[PDB]
Write a protein that binds this ligand. Sequence first.
Ligand SMILES: Cc1ccc(C2CC2)c(-c2ccc3c(c2C)CCCO3)c1[C@H](OC(C)(C)C)C(=O)O
Ligand SMILES: Cc1ccc(C2CC2)c(-c2ccc3c(c2C)CCCO3)c1[C@H](OC(C)(C)C)C(=O)O
Ligand SMILES: [Cl-]
Ligand SMILES: [Mg+2]
Ligand SMILES: [Mg+2]
Lengths: 53, 141, 144, 52
Amino acid sequence: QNFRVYYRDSRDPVWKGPAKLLEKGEGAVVIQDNSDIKVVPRRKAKIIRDYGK
Amino acid sequence: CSPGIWQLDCTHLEGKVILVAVHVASGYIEAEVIPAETGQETAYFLLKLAGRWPVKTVHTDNGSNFTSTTVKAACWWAGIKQEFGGVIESMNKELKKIIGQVRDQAEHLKTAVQMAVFIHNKKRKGYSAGERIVDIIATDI
Amino acid sequence: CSPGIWQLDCTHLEGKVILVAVHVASGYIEAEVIPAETGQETAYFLLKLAGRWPVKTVHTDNGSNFTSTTVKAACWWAGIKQEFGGVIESMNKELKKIIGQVRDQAEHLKTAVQMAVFIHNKKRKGYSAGERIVDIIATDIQTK
Amino acid sequence: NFRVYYRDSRDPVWKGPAKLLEKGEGAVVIQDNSDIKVVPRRKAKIIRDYGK
Ligand SMILES: Cc1ccc(C2CC2)c(-c2ccc3c(c2C)CCCO3)c1[C@H](OC(C)(C)C)C(=O)O
Ligand SMILES: Cc1ccc(C2CC2)c(-c2ccc3c(c2C)CCCO3)c1[C@H](OC(C)(C)C)C(=O)O
Ligand SMILES: [Cl-]
Ligand SMILES: [Mg+2]
Ligand SMILES: [Mg+2]
């Protein structure tokens, strides 16, 4: 049902998120974190759904 | 008190970090000695806890491990609501008291922690905390 | 099946040792990745399990971690009878299937293991295994 | 009262259970099968009677 995206940015090893999933491509995910739209390589993003709800 | 509500906190003995979870309505506890007081260790603990019980809300203080992104991810995936900001603090003290009573029976602190958890959960007040959590959950199915 | 009976066994993925406990009457499981397939790791797992549930009998094969003195000491301290001698084996396979389904969602194998345990215990067949173990044990308590 | 597992003959496998007879500060007097043994504290595991 619903997805949130957690991701890593510019060198920063801290995970960021939740961000809104805008679009999923083969190599990148487009997300919105608060007020910034970001294009994130798939390998640096985890798209997590609210499985237990 | 709702059957889905848990409090978690960390306490410390012998330089080691003990992560404790209490089921608020029963007093039932679970605890683990973790190697570092990090979000990733806390998130892993939460995933285990959520697979055993119907965890709906987890109340903690604002410790940086509890506000970490990996804990947010764990809670999101498991369906857990986080609330921030003294049942668990009384439990920490009680758990450390039992640990002290049994400590010289084991080499490892973690062994004494689990013996103390068992002693706490099995003691009848007259139901034990371990009986009460199962009674409360079952009746709420 | 009696409410107190558990089966334990180790299984392996990615060179890691996964210790699995199944409550036979419900199908509920708990599992942990342990650093070595040893008696001391098995004894510590059992002490944790016994503090959560009313463990009366544990059934295992004859693997040397299950017949070790540390495990005998844990079982004596906690009041657990051991029996030696295919619920858990079927459960190992099911757990591995779910782990394989979710494995690419996590960096660490242990994370996938606990995700799989959750998926297994929360699935409604109409009760889930997590609901059944709690109902079975509560009924025992409430009627004594 | 208590129960004792112990190591002695340069063997890392824990032995026991033995009967506890005395808990010294440095050593433990136990009986195992029919032998009286005196073991240093660090080679003994003295566990109070809990569980059953
Ligand atoms: C290593 C790591 C880094 C970041 C993240 C999250 C993106 C912010 C996670 C993580 C945390 C919780 C969780 C899930 C994951 C993917 C998947 C769904 C179930 O809940 C992990 C995770 O490892 C543990 C030890 C659990 C933190 C892993 O193995 O990948
Ligand atoms: C290190 C060690 C070596 C031997 C033993 C037993 C003598 C054969 C134990 C042991 C095993 C089970 C157990 C208890 C102990 C003391 C105490 C009562 C509760 O059940 C331990 C123990 O460590 C774990 C990780 C649990 C194996 C420890 O910390 O001393
Ligand atoms: Cl793309
Ligand atoms: Mg705190
Ligand atoms: Mg086996």
